[PDB]
Design a binder for this molecule. Structure first.
Ligand SMILES: Nc1nc2c(ncn2[C@@H]2O[C@H](COP(=O)(O)OP(=O)(O)O)[C@@H](O)[C@H]2O)c(=O)[nH]1
Length: 169
């Protein structure tokens, strides 16, 4: 439907979600993507908390408008952690995710049909993940030792992708 309901499993392609709290309101906005093209996109506004999964990787997501606030992941198979992080970055509509679009991206297919902007961004980044990580930035990992940082190669690290933390497991 239109909005993800508390406790309801939902899909955004490869990302699975399930609301813990909050409400979003969606408004259309002209967004500048890093391409230099300006595209009309449905921007959610409000604080939202979700359970998320990509394959075997689980976590909890907090967002606000156009910002991934916090993402706590449970340790898992590396490919899945990497995609869960990408899918969370796109799902949150973070200003930095928009900036990382470098190459051409289509919002219309060759038959001239209408494609989903958020879906097409997910497709662009699952395939060119670098292009998001370039924009993302690092911060000091959490002081506690039940919590670790992770870098874009998915190894534990003393500096971590901003807002991202890992628990074992
Ligand atoms: N933050 C947030 N995003 C949602 C919610 N419900 C759906 N979405 C996402 O909002 C986007 C909807 O975009 P799309 O399906 O292309 O529909 P459009 O916005 O009507 O053009 C998708 O990426 C969904 O995963 C919600 O409750 N909160």
């Amino acid at each position: 439907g239109s909005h993800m309901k508390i406790r309801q499993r939902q899909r955004f392609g490869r990302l699975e979600l399930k609301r813990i709290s909050g409400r979003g309101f969606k408004n259309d906005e002209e967004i500048l993507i890093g391409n230099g093209t300006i595209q009309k996109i449905g921007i959610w506004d409000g604080e939202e908390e979700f359970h998320v999964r990509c394959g075997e990787c689980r976590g909890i997501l907090k967002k606000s408008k156009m910002k991934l606030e916090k993402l706590l992941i449970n340790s898992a198979k590396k490919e899945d952690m990497r995609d869960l992080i990408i899918l969370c970055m796109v799902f949150s509509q973070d200003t930095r995710m928009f900036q990382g679009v470098r190459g051409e991206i289509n919002f219309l297919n060759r038959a001239g049909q209408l494609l989903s902007p958020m879906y097409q961004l997910q497709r662009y980044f699952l395939n060119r993940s670098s292009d998001l990580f370039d924009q993302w930035g690092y911060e000091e990992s959490p002081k506690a030792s039940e919590l670790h940082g992770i870098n874009e190669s998915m190894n534990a690290s003393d500096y971590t992708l901003k807002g991202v933390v890992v628990t074992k497991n």
